[PDB]
Amino acid sequence: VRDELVWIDCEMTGLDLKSDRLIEIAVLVTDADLNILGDGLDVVIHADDESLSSMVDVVKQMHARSGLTEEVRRSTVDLATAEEMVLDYIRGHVKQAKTAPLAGNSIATDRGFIARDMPKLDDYLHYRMIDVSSIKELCRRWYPRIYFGQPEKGRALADIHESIRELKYYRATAFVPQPGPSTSDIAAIAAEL
Amino acid sequence: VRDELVWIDCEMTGLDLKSDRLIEIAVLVTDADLNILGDGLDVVIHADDESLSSMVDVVKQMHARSGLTEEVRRSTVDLATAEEMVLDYIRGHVKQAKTAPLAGNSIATDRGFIARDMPKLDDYLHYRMIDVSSIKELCRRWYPRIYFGQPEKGLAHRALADIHESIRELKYYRATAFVPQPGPSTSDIAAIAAEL
Ligand SMILES: [K+]
Ligand SMILES: [K+]
């Protein structure tokens, strides 16, 4: 029951939903214990030269240096095809609609582009998301040693792998050992709240 | 200084960023220990009858029953004024831009409307957010007893009451799913990081 997390990372020409284009999407599925269930999928999505010419210089330099911009010019994959490839990959692991949450770092940004451009993928995923950066920001306040001790971080598919490693790290440090507290302790705490 | 969490909940005519209107916004600031730093602020934002008439029946019924729809009709507050009232409230507690994260349940939805309609508020908050529902969904898998033991929610469907429920939910997870402070040793943390 509920043994899949869908990990997605996107790259864009920028973060403005009124004008920027989605140019890369990667997907990996894990079980609930963060074991990777397959090799996943990453797709570079075509954007025309006019769209790419709108990138601010910091993003232009980043996408030039990673080789993404040249891959975008050479891509023959449109939005609808990328959506079908990602959703078919997910449906191989996730059997029910509106069950699997989207997981990643600052995943709301990626979900904004998916909602705009990939409505079928948006509708298939649970509306709830697992933002690893939510846990990062809580540890930053509650457990500074955990925040400063994060494993070192190194394109969509590599970013996903690092998000999974960061959550594994928080599970092992910030979260209680299974099975967690007693049913009576839980009841007492809930009662006060 | 990283104490402060900014808690915001919005109400809308619907969740479609192409057409729906933001009709209520509430804000509370907490310290890092989730103590409320003031009484906060909630503002009903005017929308015209044409916009309100586009609400699907389940949303129409929710906003009718809470009194929100009638408060919207009577409101003289526009988006720019609501944004200024919320941002002035936050700036009383949060001294630096791009420092305080936005906190709530499924807070991405609210942030989407804030980014569209309130660019100054959007820019003042950290881009990072604390989604209490992220913790809920992790506990649902890792600690079913914690997930099923959550405190009962009032379900006011009004911005300020919803914020209070989000804070109580995070207090509940902090007391159950998270290790007692100060947590594991620097050496234990290093050993775990090394394996990953
Ligand atoms: K990215
Ligand atoms: K709400």
Numbering used by the authors:
A (entry chain A): 1 to 154, 158 to 196
B (entry chain B): 1 to 196
The authors write:
Orns are highly conserved DnaQ-fold 3′-5' exoribonucleases with a DEDDh active site motif that degrade short 2- to 5-mer oligoribonucleotides in 3′-5' direction and release monoribonucleotides as reaction products.
The structure of Ms_orn in apo form was determined to 1.87 Å resolution to a final Rwork of 17.9% and Rfree of 22.2%. The overall structure of Ms_orn consists of the typical RNase-H fold of DnaQ-like exoribonuclease superfamily of proteins consisting of five central β sheets, β5-β4-β1-β2-β3 (arranged in ↑↑↑↓↑ direction) and nine α helices, along with an additional C-terminal helix, α10. Although the terminal residues 197 to 209 of Ms_orn lacked any discernible density, a significant part of the unique C-terminal tail of Ms_orn (residues 181–196) could be built and formed the additional helix, α10, through residues 186 to 195. The C-terminal helix hence provides additional interactions for dimer formation by burying an additional ∼1000 Å2 surface area in Ms_orn. The catalytic Asp9, Glu11, Asp110, and Asp162 along with the general base His157, which are characteristic of DEDDh family of exoribonucleases, are conserved in the active site of Ms_orn, as expected. In the apo form of Ms_orn, we observed only one monovalent cation, K+ ion, that was coordinated by Asp9 and Glu11 in all the chains. The catalytic pocket of Ms_orn is also lined by Glu11, His63, Val59, and Met12, which prevent accommodation of oligonucleotides that are longer on the 3' end of pGpG, as suggested earlier.
